[PDB]
Ligand SMILES: *[C@@H]1O[C@H](CO)[C@@H](O[C@@H]2O[C@H](CO)[C@@H](O[C@@H]3O[C@H](CO[C@H]4O[C@H](CO)[C@@H](O)[C@H](O)[C@@H]4O)[C@@H](O)[C@H](O)[C@@H]3O)[C@H](O)[C@H]2NC(C)=O)[C@H](O)[C@H]1NC(C)=O
Ligand SMILES: *[C@@H]1O[C@H](CO)[C@@H](O[C@@H]2O[C@H](CO)[C@@H](O[C@@H]3O[C@H](CO[C@H]4O[C@H](CO)[C@@H](O)[C@H](O)[C@@H]4O)[C@@H](O)[C@H](O)[C@@H]3O)[C@H](O)[C@H]2NC(C)=O)[C@H](O)[C@H]1NC(C)=O
Ligand SMILES: [Br-]
Ligand SMILES: [Br-]
Ligand SMILES: [Br-]
Ligand SMILES: [Br-]
Ligand SMILES: [Br-]
Ligand SMILES: [Br-]
Ligand SMILES: [Br-]
Ligand SMILES: [Br-]
């Protein structure tokens with residue numbers, strides 16, 4: 001809720017926010033895999049099973065096709081938005097990796113004139129840290145993230161907008177002109193606000209003060225467009241694609257094509273085309289008989305019986321048979337379907 | 347290819363290389379959509395079509411299931427590798443943004459001293475901390491064949507340098523190692539960066555009035571980021587995953603080469619339905635069956651076979667009673683799945 005304030009924290013939050021979306025997308029990919037498998041199992045079993053079993057599979061087919069189609073279309077819609085966010089967030093992370101290197105400044109040059117004269121060689125530069133970047137890893141401890149929280153989450157912070165010329169001058173005492181015992185120290189630091197401490201420093205230069213600032217906008221809009229890319233997913237309603245499963249009776253039960261095919265296939269009224277063509281109690285009683293009461297046995301029995309349907313199996317000494325669940329691959333299911341239809345032709 | 351030498355060039359080349367892989371991945375995704383559609387049409391038409399067409403469809407069906415399965419498995423193997431490359435490349439690109447801001451150094455403090463008192467107005471230059479803001483200037487062979495020989499991306503900046511100038515005496519003509527710092531002295535300290543360590547103090551100590559890098563410090567901004575991205579691109583190639591799902595069910599050459607195809611031609615088109623081996627028929631008879639069903643060498647596969655498949659009539663839901671239409675007019679998986687149920691019910695009835 002409060003803006004991030006360190007490079008390690010901003011990167012950590014931006015990546016954690018991205019994970020909200022990519023993990024949900026990965027769930028959809030897995031769900032599309034399971035729905036594809038389920039739909040293939042239904043078609044194969046619907047061809048191979050005995051009529052009492054076939055009649056229980058048929059009401060699943062149109063509704064399952066509806067779930068699978070929508071699931072694929074939702075993933076296809078989300079795919080470019082998630083890809084766009086990934087690219088933009090990871091580029092911003094790259095800049096944060098550098099802002100962490102600069103978070104302690106860039107060192108200093110300190111001249112100590114020695115005491116004898118004001119001649120100068122490298123040996124009078126006692127400090128020469130200038131150009132040293134910060135190399136330590138992020139602190140191991142540091143920092144509500146959730147899709148519900150995304151709408152008011154603030155932009156990632158820019159952290160550094162200015163570089164500062166730090167200066168110290170101490171004679172003898174304040175710079176009393178520079179003489180043989182004078183320490184002159186000049187450094188470069190960064191912050192998110194401009195600094196000019198010239199007023200206090202000119203009356204007491206023996207204190208390190210930022211005496212000039214220059215523009216150093218490293219992030220530019222990178223964090224803004226990454227932030228906006230996350231909103232683009234939410235605006236399109238693409239944050240949780242393909243969340244419905246064919247193996248969830250709640251998804252199937254709600255489809256009008258399911259109820260209608262219960263009437264056609266399980267209440268012996270095959271010419272029905274409206275939901276009203278049978279009394280609701282007879283639809284419900286048929287549902288109860290086929291799938292357990294209110295579909296309570298859909299997974300414990302219906303999908304188990306579907307998986308135990310025996311289908312043709314290729315073999316060099318002659319075609320054999322086994323169950324859908326034992327030959328659990330699309331190539332074997334497609335081969336069975338071809339073989340089942342050939343037997344009907346033959 | 348010589349290594350990249352600028353931040354704008356390194357970022358550009360890395361993204362261009364990445365695009366070689368993501369574009370091929372996108373092609374596989376598109377092919378998988380087309381393959382899923384092709385397979386669903388085949389299953390649907392195989393149930394609905396007249397027996398003459400069913401026999402033409404059945405060998406396409408078993409091969410199509412195999413092609414589609416391989417296609418999905420290739421995409422599943424490629425997906426985490428491509429995602430990793432994208433993440434690592436884009437993190438490196440972000441660092442190169444900053445390396446571009448730093449490519450012209452970070453300015454300087456110049457102190458122009460009548461006396462040797464000092465306030466800000468004696469600092470003529472105060473550019474220290476000024477980063478470079480301009481866009482990239484408006485680099486090389488890029489291609490998968492060229493990827494094995496591509497060098498690692500350049501780090502560009504490995505060290506920061508303290509540059510120093512000291513010019514004492516009127517006209518600022520003299521070195522400060524012999525003409526001590528006095529009222530006319532110009533003292534300039536700056537910060538630049540490069541890809542090599544530097545220590546030019548030996549020459550500077552005898553002539554301080556020339557700008558020289560008299561000290562260097564470590565400034566490794568990229569770390570391993572760019573090399574780790576490079577290695578992620580190689581990880582795709584090592585896995586043989588650069589062109590996943592390149593085969594199309596609508597490409598007869600892919601169908602013909604699928605191991606399931608020949609046997610089903612024998613079973614469905616040569617009146618040997620119990621065949622289980624390719625030796626169950628002469629190869630010449632298989633070829634004649636292929637020529638009759640799909641045109642000579644499959645030359646009519648798209649112009650005739652798939653048009654005939656698409657014109658198969660299937661059931662269509664309607665409130666005043668079930669109607670019929672063609673696969674191509676009812677061109678959606680949900681209408682095909684509904685048709686399959688209605689077809690199987692009709693057989694039951
Ligand atoms: C590209 O270079 C980057 C450095 O410029 C790499 O980032 C560094 O990666 C190392 C791991 O190899 C990290 O070291 C670890 O840090 C964690 C703590 O940091 C994490 O947790 C805190 C607290 O939540 C969080 O604020 C941070 O953002 C991190 O999420 C320690 O627990 C470990 O013990 C270990 O010390 C560095 O911290 C990390 N630096 C930064 C700035 O992220 C980066 O991994 C490189 N990229 C690739 C693709 O290799
Ligand atoms: C994050 O901030 C970055 C700055 O740190 C953004 O990058 C800058 O984006 C602008 C506009 O998008 C680019 O300006 C354009 O530059 C091109 C020329 O550069 C391109 O082509 C050369 C080859 O000629 C290639 O070497 C470069 O790498 C680029 O591919 C001009 O033709 C345009 O007219 C326009 O001036 C900057 O060049 C670019 N800077 C860098 C260092 O990339 C970046 O877009 C931000 N990220 C996001 C996601 O918005
Ligand atoms: Br995924
Ligand atoms: Br499957
Ligand atoms: Br039964
Ligand atoms: Br001293
Ligand atoms: Br009834
Ligand atoms: Br029942
Ligand atoms: Br019920
Ligand atoms: Br894609």
Ligand SMILES: [Br-]
Pocket residue numbers: 382383384386679
């Ligand atoms: Br489809």
Ligand SMILES: [Br-]
Pocket residue numbers: 043385386389390
């Ligand atoms: Br199908």
Ligand SMILES: [Br-]
Pocket residue numbers: 458459460529530531
């Ligand atoms: Br002067």
Ligand SMILES: [Br-]
Pocket residue numbers: 467468469470
């Ligand atoms: Br002046």
Ligand SMILES: [Br-]
Pocket residue numbers: 366488489490491
């Ligand atoms: Br290529």
Ligand SMILES: [Br-]
Pocket residue numbers: 490491493583588
């Ligand atoms: Br390759």
Ligand SMILES: [Br-]
Pocket residue numbers: 500501502503541
């Ligand atoms: Br380099």
Ligand SMILES: [Br-]
Pocket residue numbers: 458459530531
């Ligand atoms: Br002068």
Ligand SMILES: [Br-]
Pocket residue numbers: 569570571573
């Ligand atoms: Br490395």
Ligand SMILES: [Br-]
Pocket residue numbers: 582583584585586587588589
């Ligand atoms: Br490859």
Ligand SMILES: [Br-]
Pocket residue numbers: 627628629630
């Ligand atoms: Br032969």
Ligand SMILES: [Br-]
Pocket residue numbers: 616627628631
């Ligand atoms: Br023959």
Ligand SMILES: [Br-]
Pocket residue numbers: 402638639
């Ligand atoms: Br034929």
Ligand SMILES: [Br-]
Pocket residue numbers: 596647648649652653
């Ligand atoms: Br075609």
Ligand SMILES: [Br-]
Pocket residue numbers: 394395396657658659
């Ligand atoms: Br027809």
